Design an enzyme around this catalytic site. Structure first.
Site, PDB file in Angstrom:
ATOM      1  N   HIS A 166      -9.614   1.053   4.513  1.00 26.32           N
ATOM      2  CA  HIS A 166      -8.380   1.288   5.244  1.00 26.32           C
ATOM      3  C   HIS A 166      -8.636   2.169   6.462  1.00 26.32           C
ATOM      4  O   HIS A 166      -9.454   3.092   6.425  1.00 26.32           O
ATOM      5  CB  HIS A 166      -7.356   1.969   4.341  1.00 26.32           C
ATOM      6  CG  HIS A 166      -5.977   1.927   4.905  1.00 26.32           C
ATOM      7  ND1 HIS A 166      -5.513   2.855   5.814  1.00 26.32           N
ATOM      8  CD2 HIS A 166      -4.982   1.027   4.733  1.00 26.32           C
ATOM      9  CE1 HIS A 166      -4.277   2.538   6.157  1.00 26.32           C
ATOM     10  NE2 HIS A 166      -3.932   1.434   5.515  1.00 26.32           N
ATOM     11  N   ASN A 174       0.869  -1.181   0.000  1.00 24.16           N
ATOM     12  CA  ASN A 174       0.000   0.000   0.000  1.00 24.16           C
ATOM     13  C   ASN A 174       0.904   1.228   0.000  1.00 24.16           C
ATOM     14  O   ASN A 174       1.442   1.601   1.041  1.00 24.16           O
ATOM     15  CB  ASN A 174      -0.913   0.002   1.223  1.00 24.16           C
ATOM     16  CG  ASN A 174      -1.788   1.238   1.301  1.00 24.16           C
ATOM     17  OD1 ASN A 174      -1.859   2.020   0.356  1.00 24.16           O
ATOM     18  ND2 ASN A 174      -2.458   1.420   2.434  1.00 24.16           N
ATOM     19  N   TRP A 175       1.059   1.865  -1.164  1.00 25.69           N
ATOM     20  CA  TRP A 175       1.917   3.045  -1.260  1.00 25.69           C
ATOM     21  C   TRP A 175       1.350   4.258  -0.535  1.00 25.69           C
ATOM     22  O   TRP A 175       2.077   5.241  -0.361  1.00 25.69           O
ATOM     23  CB  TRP A 175       2.150   3.416  -2.720  1.00 25.69           C
ATOM     24  CG  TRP A 175       2.913   2.427  -3.547  1.00 25.69           C
ATOM     25  CD1 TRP A 175       3.303   1.158  -3.208  1.00 25.69           C
ATOM     26  CD2 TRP A 175       3.355   2.640  -4.891  1.00 25.69           C
ATOM     27  NE1 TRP A 175       3.965   0.571  -4.275  1.00 25.69           N
ATOM     28  CE2 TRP A 175       4.010   1.470  -5.312  1.00 25.69           C
ATOM     29  CE3 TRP A 175       3.265   3.720  -5.776  1.00 25.69           C
ATOM     30  CZ2 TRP A 175       4.574   1.350  -6.583  1.00 25.69           C
ATOM     31  CZ3 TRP A 175       3.820   3.593  -7.041  1.00 25.69           C
ATOM     32  CH2 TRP A 175       4.465   2.420  -7.429  1.00 25.69           C
ATOM     33  N   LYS A 176       0.091   4.220  -0.113  1.00 27.00           N
ATOM     34  CA  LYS A 176      -0.576   5.363   0.522  1.00 27.00           C
ATOM     35  C   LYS A 176      -0.434   6.576  -0.399  1.00 27.00           C
ATOM     36  O   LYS A 176      -0.462   6.448  -1.631  1.00 27.00           O
ATOM     37  CB  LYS A 176      -0.108   5.564   1.964  1.00 27.00           C
ATOM     38  CG  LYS A 176      -0.164   4.288   2.778  1.00 27.00           C
ATOM     39  CD  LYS A 176      -0.066   4.556   4.267  1.00 27.00           C
ATOM     40  CE  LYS A 176      -0.172   3.262   5.051  1.00 27.00           C
ATOM     41  NZ  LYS A 176      -0.076   3.542   6.519  1.00 27.00           N
ATOM     42  N   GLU A 202      -5.762  -4.636  10.493  1.00 28.18           N
ATOM     43  CA  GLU A 202      -4.881  -3.539  10.894  1.00 28.18           C
ATOM     44  C   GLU A 202      -4.915  -3.344  12.402  1.00 28.18           C
ATOM     45  O   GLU A 202      -5.957  -2.937  12.941  1.00 28.18           O
ATOM     46  CB  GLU A 202      -5.249  -2.226  10.222  1.00 28.18           C
ATOM     47  CG  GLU A 202      -5.076  -2.142   8.739  1.00 28.18           C
ATOM     48  CD  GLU A 202      -5.622  -0.828   8.233  1.00 28.18           C
ATOM     49  OE1 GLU A 202      -6.807  -0.695   7.887  1.00 28.18           O
ATOM     50  OE2 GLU A 202      -4.859   0.155   8.357  1.00 28.18           O
ATOM     51  N   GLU A 249      -7.130   4.586   7.688  1.00 27.38           N
ATOM     52  CA  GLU A 249      -6.975   6.027   7.500  1.00 27.38           C
ATOM     53  C   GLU A 249      -8.241   6.633   6.902  1.00 27.38           C
ATOM     54  O   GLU A 249      -8.608   7.769   7.234  1.00 27.38           O
ATOM     55  CB  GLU A 249      -5.748   6.304   6.619  1.00 27.38           C
ATOM     56  CG  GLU A 249      -4.461   5.986   7.383  1.00 27.38           C
ATOM     57  CD  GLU A 249      -3.273   5.648   6.505  1.00 27.38           C
ATOM     58  OE1 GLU A 249      -3.350   5.732   5.255  1.00 27.38           O
ATOM     59  OE2 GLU A 249      -2.248   5.190   7.073  1.00 27.38           O
ATOM     60  N   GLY A 288       1.978   4.772  16.303  1.00 28.17           N
ATOM     61  CA  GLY A 288       2.364   5.947  17.071  1.00 28.17           C
ATOM     62  C   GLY A 288       2.354   5.794  18.573  1.00 28.17           C
ATOM     63  O   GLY A 288       2.510   6.793  19.286  1.00 28.17           O
ATOM     64  N   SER A 331       2.814  -3.413  11.177  1.00 28.26           N
ATOM     65  CA  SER A 331       4.189  -3.193  10.749  1.00 28.26           C
ATOM     66  C   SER A 331       4.814  -4.501  10.287  1.00 28.26           C
ATOM     67  O   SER A 331       4.897  -5.466  11.048  1.00 28.26           O
ATOM     68  CB  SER A 331       4.993  -2.605  11.900  1.00 28.26           C
ATOM     69  OG  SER A 331       6.321  -2.379  11.470  1.00 28.26           O
ATOM     70  N   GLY A 382       2.982  -1.386   4.553  1.00 27.54           N
ATOM     71  CA  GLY A 382       3.047   0.064   4.521  1.00 27.54           C
ATOM     72  C   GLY A 382       4.413   0.593   4.115  1.00 27.54           C
ATOM     73  O   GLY A 382       4.770   0.560   2.936  1.00 27.54           O
ATOM     74  N   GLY A 383       5.200   1.058   5.089  1.00 32.20           N
ATOM     75  CA  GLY A 383       6.461   1.719   4.770  1.00 32.20           C
ATOM     76  C   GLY A 383       7.389   0.905   3.885  1.00 32.20           C
ATOM     77  O   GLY A 383       8.023   1.443   2.974  1.00 32.20           O
TER      78      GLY A 383
END
Lengths: 252, 252
Positions: free
Chosen positions: B96, B9-11, B167, B98, B173, B213, B234-235
């Site tokens: 998602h 997922n490149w977001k 998720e 977000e 965070g 993650s 993700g990242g």
């Protein structure tokens, strides 16, 4: 001198292939003349990179229909101003009535989107307009003035980079029509509040486009008004002969 | 047999040019092997048409990160399932965390988006997951069960076409991490409610991807769990060596 502009808003229409073919058909239709106005096609995000190479950039610009309220990062599904600019598009519609109505866009969110658009060299087409209940209460002036707070926080130099578009949202699905006289009245009011904020020179250089129903048969009467500088076109944007017929209203 | 899948997922990352180059770099990195899993890149809308021709379709599929809750029409800024499919993309991330958090996506809206995705031949990657306050109250099971109502209105045949992704939003965070044991526990619960709805065969054929993650150093331990069928990354999706290192966790 203030620009006359015909900008088509394709909304959520056209597959990839249909949008490519529509852009090619429009480019072919404008090949034999220099329009006496700027011409812009605002497409869904999927088409931007495919359509910018297909149009004569001296005649037709390309815009997105929205951009994100953040520069980049963990905002799955959103497309940023930097992304829009990277496709070759030079414009972005912001604040369209459909996004205010359906997607919760506020004065604060739109203020941030406009800043991000300008930071990436995009020309915002910033939309304002009141709904039926507001028009019936004669509140159109206070409504558009409140919506303009998203852009009246800009410096004079930044404000000079934006286009405005007025949407008579009250004319959607109600059988009502904003007459050319009504369009001129509210466009003149919008220009007057720009002048109140920045002075007359900035106001006189702002393109204020009419965003109600615009067709070849009514475009000349609408655009002949002194405070109407063209149109943000809906349905007619999806048919070459209709879009060109509106562009023709600016012929000398 | 149930598919193992690594979906990136490149977001909201990568300009047009950067996404083209990233897709080319990933395609080159996978050129010399047949991955032992499906591989998908989910990009912003602007890249879809440009990246589908650049990847070996036998190894790498392409997805969007969202689609609209209507088929077409007056929804300025939105991109429809039909538009996504017309780019050659075969997948779409829906629900998602977000978009649930920032863009107001509800059970009803997501139910409609999933239907539209399936009507256009797209494979939804349907995301569920609970926030910190829900996890701390031990409400994760009831939260994900409620979110699954967007897809439990599907027929068995339609449900069999979707991928799920869990998720652990509570791990964003906060310094927290869902351990492999915690991932397995909730994935097993999700599979059990699929079985409750449709029977064990449909549940055993559903790919349930871990969406927390995921990095080369933890992917093998996560994916070795019996109810974890890969990852929604993700990242690590934005760096070829990291994304490939996760894909390598499925090597035989």
């Amino acid at each position: 001198m203030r620009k006359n502009i015909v900008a088509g808003n394709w909304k959520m229409n056209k597959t990839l292939q249909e949008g490519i073919a529509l852009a090619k058909e429009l480019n072919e239709a404008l090949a034999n003349e220099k329009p006496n106005c700027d011409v812009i096609i605002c497409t869904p995000f999927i088409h931007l990179a495919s359509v910018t190479p297909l149009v004569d950039a001296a005649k037709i610009g390309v815009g997105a229909e929205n951009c994100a309220d953040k520069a980049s990062g963990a905002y799955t599904g959103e497309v940023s101003a930097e992304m829009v600019a990277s496709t070759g598009a030079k414009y972005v519609i912001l604040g369209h009535s459909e996004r205010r109505a359906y997607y919760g866009e506020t004065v604060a969110i739109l203020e941030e989107k406009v800043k991000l658009a300008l930071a990436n060299g995009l020309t915002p087409i910033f939309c304002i307009g009141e709904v039926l209940e507001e028009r019936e209460a004669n509140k159109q002036n206070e409504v558009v003035a409140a919506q303009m707070e998203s852009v009246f926080s800009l410096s004079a130099e930044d404000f000079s980079k934006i286009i405005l578009a007025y949407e008579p949202v009250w004319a959607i699905g109600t059988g009502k029509t904003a007459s050319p006289e009504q369009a001129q009245e509210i466009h003149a009011f919008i220009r007057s509040i720009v002048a109140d904020k920045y002075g007359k020179e900035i106001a006189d250089n702002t393109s204020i486009l009419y965003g109600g129903s615009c067709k070849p048969s009514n475009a000349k009467e609408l655009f002949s008004n002194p405070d109407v500088d063209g149109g943000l076109i809906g349905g007619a944007a999806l048919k070459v002969s209709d879009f060109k017929g509106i562009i023709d209203a600016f012929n000398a």
